[model samples]
Target: GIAVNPDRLKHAKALVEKAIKQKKIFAIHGPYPVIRSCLRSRGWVEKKFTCDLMSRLLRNEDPNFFWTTKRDAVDCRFLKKDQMLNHYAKAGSFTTKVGLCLNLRNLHWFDDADPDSFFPRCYRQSFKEDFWHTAARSILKRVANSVPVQIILTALEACERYLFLHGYYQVIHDGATIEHSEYYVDQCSEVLHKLEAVNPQLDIEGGRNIWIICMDRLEEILKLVVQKYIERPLLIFGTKFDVRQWFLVTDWNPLTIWFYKECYVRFSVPTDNMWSSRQLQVHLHKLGAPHAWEAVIVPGMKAAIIHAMQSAQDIVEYRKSSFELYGADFMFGENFHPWLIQINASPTMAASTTVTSRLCAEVQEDTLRIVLDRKLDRNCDIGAFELIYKQ
Candidate 1:
């Protein structure tokens, strides 16, 4: 191989300038100090900005280039600082020197190699396409073994299916039949059957009735609002809401599940209008504010949750050294009959009120403590978690 000339920096700088002039963006992998010096020498200014710029954009305010307190160190592992900065500059349209800085300080398992052949390929794509998509794919790949993607993909429907099969609870389309006439469609119910059901129109019309028709000839993604009936919905303060309780499964082989003692409720705002009502307003209250029936309202709630998890076990494949955290949601009917709404794999951690925030903080702290105690070698109180299900 021919020895690369050290003066190649000037050539690289020319290429960058040409690309910028052509409005074409691309990344380069090269020495950190060399790229920085080249940019400075070429009269390119440093990009001084903070996260506040993005935050301002969200609020419909003009984004101001606010100087950051400190320029965080770029951890590109084996790749030098300049190469990463160059990559960022390319992605940002070469407006200012900005790129992603990854903390590779903990990386020690990679085969250390020179920057020339080690740096990966780059793409000329938007931030959403290049960054978010890449990160999402990387995450999916990383968790591929520990967490089964197919299981999660099937998780939503399986939960409802499990309930239907177990005979403990009934879900949508429980005893409903489907027929195929070119395309799949539900069998239209008779007038008497419609009158007997809670929602007469819905039961009668079925999927065969076309709810919407798109007249536009353009190749655009159509937005459709699909509806589901919440059978015998329970209400609080004239508003509907569901219980979001945290559940932890420590081990999967000999299935072990734990339920956090403290759980929070998310209530929907009250509405006077019918099902398609647009009148809704939000009001925040203390934890367990609406319902005074803490562990008092539903007696079969615990048993139901346990049964739900057991049903999940039948569908889910067990893996060794694997654990899962879920936000198991539940609702009750007017008669105080508990119903499992759904189980969220990644639930929102946002706190609605000061009390909720404090409670979330405690749950997070306890979760960390428990994980440290179990997986990591740490002594912590594991008694707070009540063992609900074990196989």
Candidate 2:
């Protein structure tokens, strides 16, 4: 063990403050052209690719703007009281795949005060067939009372190919042959065995479900079994599209949320010929330009986002002055109903299309307004960004 003197270290800290006054900085190693251009115009210089986590600050040079793509080890103490910027959130409730699904699925808020069904029901993959049976009884009991809710066992890729990638077992989809059965068993084993060797990532319980249903064998037949995954059913001509909306969190303690006025929707590549028809395109465009009922979907989308942020607000290290922008993804089910699918910690700012390029430009422009103008106590138009939640 070594003992150090803070008395000597405190002397170096004084010198670091002098360089902070030279120029406003925007630290980034991303292809965010629109934001880069705006920062320069706003009298900020870009401090490109030099790790500051233990770099600039440790070596006696400091930059105000902090942007990280993948998660990195950085502390909040490095930031000044009035100097505010960062692209990372401490806890990723809406960002991580597994985290967001579990948060929305088990929302304690929905227990008594469910204003609406914003998150879909989720059942985890398990060794026991108990949940599978429960899913069936839900359909039957609801149907017996003449309730019209369809139980969907999640939608995924084409049969054996899907099983081979990330194995799961249920009454596998439509196919009737002994050879069909054998191939599926092999696919399950191949995927499960290789998981440990060339492991990327998977829930062990996910494989355990396969062991019971496929390997151990349910040893019985069941009617209408729904698996761990649940997704809303789609009628023909229904789109497989998702909307990416931008939202900002300026403060975590009193928790403020700002949402952009507009968003662009992207469609999934057509998996079937049903979408190849012209009529489908018209339907897609109608939903695409949801300006018709922009008022309707915005609240549905915006409200879900607030709760998503709330679900994990306590985990953040609250430096109240710093601001972070997040991209929230929302999808639609039957009847234009919205569902929260995913949220991006770092949403793409690259201009993929003219529609996207222009929108990205404006989002950055307004984002800076929140970052700088509000700090200076300046009254300026924040473009399309709206103050949706503050509590």
Candidate 3:
């Protein structure tokens, strides 16, 4: 449903040309011996054409050298890949220069126009009522009023004072007593006045979503929800998810995701697998694993996560040999896992170090295929890289 406007592309193409004239042609420099050691482990042998091709693409995308620098070449391990493109977007010349680092997790962006497919289906709000606008306006009104005359002595002081507050809630004061006639349930007098003082730091608990409170301390909060709503359906907000590390995804298992639903696919790890195969699958299919993609998941998706990605030497040769050993239709969705890794950007296509030599040489190539190519036969185009920023 996304459309590319040729007019915008033409406008952007002109700007890129102008920037290149400024002697700011962006590029990635490589051939670092240290990366050769790393790429060799992943079965990657650097060649002149690989470097040249990557540089050509860099220039094609953005002739301005806004992002590329001396340190970045060394940091990318001289592989000259675009894994640090934290986000893939459609901004003009500005897009190439703006990127998140490789180490950060959960990078996402959203505008008013983002589609429902990009985010959790439940978070969608009907246009029937301006619920979000109303709620936000009320919050702003309250915030504007909460500042005392004395607190407004300086801008920084006012901001910090507001940061310490919880919406619709306040840190209970010491020795305070409450008179809850028949109106309220928890009476401040019934419990100690200094309940907020017990923790490492006092936190004001207020208008946070009930599900959020439940997730924070599951055992303690589920009871509160049951007391209030019984078993009714509960939903969180579309916009507020930007502040969370985890979401109650469509899948059985709760996993961290791009808050804005930035990519086309939503891959989830089922709750059952979370208990039994999380560590094994991670070790076998991801970076921590010794076998790399040959571990089991790659073929398992063809096999269904059972025997794929686990130490196969030469997939073209292995697939032919595997079909003969297992019988016909062996590679046809027999190894596919419904839950797969969702990538937000492109991947690489070159050689890497001993640790990831078997992994993708450049992360960007595979990423572009996944996001833009639409050519299904090119599945084996490049290797995938696990974001090492968080780890």
Candidate 4:
């Protein structure tokens, strides 16, 4: 390696000034804003903005300075294919899941789609050359962590017949299919194939679908399985929304946690004012916030919700010896019920109200790191116990 000489500073400065008159430059990574009513949560500042809006700001700020945010990290309104292609052409990078959606085909957009319907109409022939996903994997490899990474296939229908032939079917109820997909490999397989097609070397592992739906038919299947075979027959979504608060009337607010056996657990939070009803406290993990995520397994109860797992453990163990087993990849359909759209390889370590005050930081951080390295190579779709209990 050669060191920069101070004597070369003047020439470097002059050439840089000349190049500034010739070309533009930009890099697109950020601490983005989450879309919510809280003004503080918007933009890395106050006021709300989506990736599309941010792109507009970047263009206006300096047509030469191209910037972009992928996966709604900085913005989410740019839901069109051509719009993304144009942005990528100018910025040279994208930080979101732009190319992953199957809905971006031009053949489907202009010819087959409804005139008033919205989706990406123009699939860029250029997007085939993009390497943002590869770059993300590279960054992870450099970190040298052992977190279980999952390759997600967001939504690719793997032929409904193929699923049924493999002993997968909708948990039928009320003469109709309820919520959740009646298929496997949609989310994880989609991501896996996409990444593999791009670069065969990046080994991102897949995670289980933390489905955010409640259905009569699906519930029956899940409950039956929990009641028969599982050692901890608790039904838990690997990831869930971090919403909290108490609303009267319906038992179904945002505070729903699908417990081990067959119940939803709602955790409690503190009240700021004397007259207010204490709210349900929910905390969001770093990897679970609707971004590309992988499954991670913790060897010991490092810093995760093990106690949270333990708090609910008794109920789970009691029902464990009775539940029947069910399928791994088949879900029914997408229902309109609001479930948390977040993903998690590890839960937060804060002591649950069910347990005394103790933080599980070791469990949380270690599980995430472990999953990143271990399970990413395998098409990891099962629960964390796969590693914990496996000899």
Candidate 5:
């Protein structure tokens, strides 16, 4: 549930007013309910009206903007149709200066019962189940070109192939037919035998291969999950963690891309033998004193991030049409090379800690400024964002 607070609205309105006074156009990225109620609140109506008037007086096509709003009366009657509004509602196809919402996925934001009932002008909208199977990885493999990407396999056969290449041994079970099942098992065993014969390998005498199981016996197993191994994992303070960096596809039509700087890093708290839990805390605190376990990042990181985003262009452009804000997670290996771990479709801004709260507030404000305020044109240093890709 969203907290309904007048102070939150006041803070938002203050940012909007500051942007207006500075002649900076900006859009917000946050929960729409809070932003909308803040705007349409009785106390803030006059300020909202003033801001809209100011933007129009300055000949700004789109002034202040909300990230996303429910397609309710407030949005339909006020946010969209009103000439005084600079706020934009995210929809299926959007050509106006409306700030697009990136939370576009499989189900409707406003309606859960209907899956395919909404359309607005922006990026692609309808979310399909099959798209998640291999879309991101497949497109990444193609787009990465010369750069190396982490190995990912979506098919059982592919996983089996990888295991065979690694010289890992497994058992084969066949229960389909007494004869055919045995034949397939023998075929796999013979292949392993040839490998062991040609190259000196440790042969596991009777281990069963999961993939070689007979079709009929599949029901006996509840679940199987396999992933490629990351041989050397990079650690922070000798603990493992991942980085969640945010980026925006502001306008997919022109292929506008914005990468936020000052992304937060999540660190693994150190735990080691010999050191009591209290002792471990002393060492961890000493190491994490400088940045509070969150960092502004380095130049190489930005390069890797750019490489990653550029690599996914094919799927992004062709699959669907919608403006999107993606929080991409990356992990480094021992060699300090960046690996694209995963992409979060709906990145959260809920602040669970004091540090995160401050960072999130900055992120939302900077996001709005970068997206709306024509800050780039004004030579404004709103945030650590660079327009890496554009048509």
Candidate 6:
């Protein structure tokens, strides 16, 4: 906060005053000083608020730009709703679990098709029926790779184990939940019918409430019977850790993107036995910083960031007048071959650590420089960010 860096608040008043006569004023809506300090220190005015922010958004006024922690805050109610022709940073893209999982089916990452570059596979499944026969049959027909050594025991081994079945947004958590294979179709149908009975509410107050209420109920139902995919994780390493890094997409139509040269490593608590079981904690949460993220990691792991982005190219599209900051998580396997774990939107910018506190603040400062400052002068500096894809 500005409290920690008192110098920032010192000239913030003048920042607002200067913004009075210009287009630097921001309808800011987040709790971070990185964004506010950069804009406010530069004389950018803030039409700020707390919980009433959403209400203020619905009015007939407009700010130079919007900066909010909430995903698509302004784009949700006014900016995009009226077809205002405004440029949108949030393209409603595939930065979601379900969205990515579905898109992976058609994604061609070069590596997906290359025998030399292997990225463990994950295929969407169905216990509802037929495809089961198709899958079992496909195994017998003989594909290119000879089906490898062990594993797979004819269609008779229906209950055998190998690949892990996973929920899109999260892990299955327990083997017993999956043990009840009979519940998949039954639960999904129940969730479908229950959700189908709920009507949409568009009148705001009551409308928004019912909408969220259904989402709450809907989320629960879907989680129970949501379609899942089977994943073959890194077979070794005792435990796995993924590096969390950020990327920015400035234009979608003529696709342009940038990669930030930093990230922190997060490891699974133990990373072992849990990998053998159903829990994610074995390889998901728990953090630790490296000597420096740029050296040992970024070089070897950076390619996957662009590969995954390009793969999503066909799945999500849009134009300019906006920018989006995205976070991608990847796990580097034996020989430093990086695997795309998943891509995230608005991934935690909270400075909950000594390292991140500085990192996050710098991120906002550089973001504004790239998004706003660079607009005025193309030759301006873009800090640690580098252009990766721009067309």
lDDT (0 to 1) per candidate: 0.35, 0.53, 0.24, 0.22, 0.39, 0.48
How do the candidates rank by TM-score, highest first?
Answer: 2, 6, 5, 1, 3, 4
Q: What are the RMSD figures for all models against the true structure?
A: 23.6, 14.7, 21.9, 25.3, 15.5, 15.0
For candidate 6, write residues 20-51 as lDDT tens digits: 45756566666766776787676565565421
After aligning candidate 3 to the native by TM-score, how far in Å is the CA of 110 from where it should be? 12
lDDT of candidate 3 over 288-339, digit per residue (tens): 4454334443332232111111111122211100000010011111122122
Model 1 misplacement above 4 A? 1-228, 269-299, 313-319, 374-380
lDDT of 1 at 55: 26
Error of 3 at 148 (Å): 22
- TM-score against native, each model: 0.35, 0.60, 0.22, 0.18, 0.42, 0.56
lDDT measured at residue 386 in model 2 versus the true structure, 0 to 100 = 92
Q: Give the Cα error of residue 114 in candidate 4, in Å.
A: 11
User: Any runs in candidate 2 off by more than 4 Å, and if so which?
Assistant: 1-23, 47-61, 71-75, 109-112, 124-239, 269-292, 313-316
In angstroms, give how far residue 344 of model 6 lies from its true place. Answer: 1.0
lDDT string, candidate 5, 191-240, tens digits: 44444443211121112222122211222432322212233355556666
Q: TM-score of predicted model 4?
A: 0.18
For lDDT, candidate 2 versus 4, the one ahead is 2
Tens-place lDDT digits, model 4, residues 1-391: 8775574545444533443343222223333111111111211211113323333333432222212333223232333221111121111111111321222222233234221111111122232111223223322222222112221111122211112211112111112222232233244444444645543223311111111122212334345301001111111243211222110100111211211111113321222111111111121132243221112111111111111111121121111101111101101001111221111221222344422111122222222223222334454432221221110
Give the C-alpha lDDT of model 6.
0.48
Decreasing lDDT order of the candidates: 2, 6, 5, 1, 3, 4
TM-score, candidate number 2: 0.60
